[PDB]
């Protein structure tokens, strides 16, 4: 199936407390493989998956230099953005960046991303054509015009459609068994009565990978949102994920409700019922 490589960068100003915190992580699909944390000891890019450890010193030296240049760039950005919005030195502010590429089942380029957020809101993003920019506000327009003048999109595009895809392919093959796997959800159901005339049905999905899944409750064959509670998909800690979907049902009609599970590890979507 499809695969992705994604890098996530977070830079946080620390008013009256020195240099910004900078954390960078790399993912292939839902598997992290590298990290840099400004508050860690090595001050280097560090391996986080067995399959990346084999890369030689040339690799690590390079990623280390690049991740520092990324750090340095956002250190300046925090100041630039504070000026753009005429903000005081009193407050802490956050710059976030994400970029990377998707490939299809044929491991050929599908899509590229390159997006910035300031204080948790969209600031600027490369559009899907990888040739133009979406700026969130008037301040962001200044960045847009500067990036148009420097022909940034053209250079990003070459990386996203070419180099980024090259890395993803190389990572996927070195990853081999773990990376390319899909683990179907191990399901089960719970049932604790709440009130005299009501009861809770919780549909469980465990040990699945990748993280992408869909749990849905149906009543007499039709969906239900709004009495259904969905917790956010969560890491189990062993490379698998977990999720659940609950619904409160009239005490006595438990058999009229069905949980529907959709995951790419499942040949066909599952329909479950309490019994």
């Amino acid at each position: 199936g499809s695969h992705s490589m994604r890098y996530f960068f977070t830079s946080v100003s620390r008013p009256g407390r020195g240099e910004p915190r900078f954390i960078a992580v790399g993912y292939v699909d839902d598997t992290q493989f590298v990290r840099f944390d400004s508050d860690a000891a090595s001050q280097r890019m560090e391996p986080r998956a067995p399959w990346i450890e084999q890369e030689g010193p040339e690799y690590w030296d390079g990623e280390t230099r690049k991740v520092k240049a990324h750090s340095q760039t956002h250190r300046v950005d925090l100041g630039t953005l504070r000026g753009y919005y005429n903000q005081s030195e009193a407050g802490s502010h956050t710059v976030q960046r994400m970029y990377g590429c998707d490939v299809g089942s044929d491991w050929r380029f599908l899509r590229g991303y390159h997006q910035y957020a300031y204080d948790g809101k969209d600031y600027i993003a490369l559009k899907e054509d990888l040739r133009s920019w979406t700026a969130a506000d008037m301040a962001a327009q200044t960045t847009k015009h500067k990036w148009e003048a420097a022909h940034v999109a053209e250079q990003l595009r070459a990386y996203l459609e070419g180099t980024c895809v090259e890395w993803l392919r190389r990572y996927l093959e070195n990853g081999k068994e773990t990376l390319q796997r899909t683990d179907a959800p191990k399901t089960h159901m719970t049932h604790h009565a709440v009130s005299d005339h009501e009861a809770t049905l919780r549909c469980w999905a465990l040990s699945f990978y990748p993280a992408e899944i869909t749990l849905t409750w149906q009543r007499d064959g039709e969906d239900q949102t709004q009495d259904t509670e969905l917790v956010e998909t969560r890491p189990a800690g062993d490379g698998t994920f977990q999720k659940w979907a609950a619904v409160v049902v009239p005490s006595g009609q438990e058999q009229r409700y069905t949980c529907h599970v959709q995951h790419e590890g499942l040949p066909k979507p599952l329909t479950l019922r309490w019994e």
Binding site: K66, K146, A150
Partner: peptide, 9 residues
């Protein structure tokens, strides 16, 4: 692998 060039906002 990371991009080799960043651009200031």
């Amino acid at each position: 692998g990371l991009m080799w060039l960043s651009y200031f906002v």
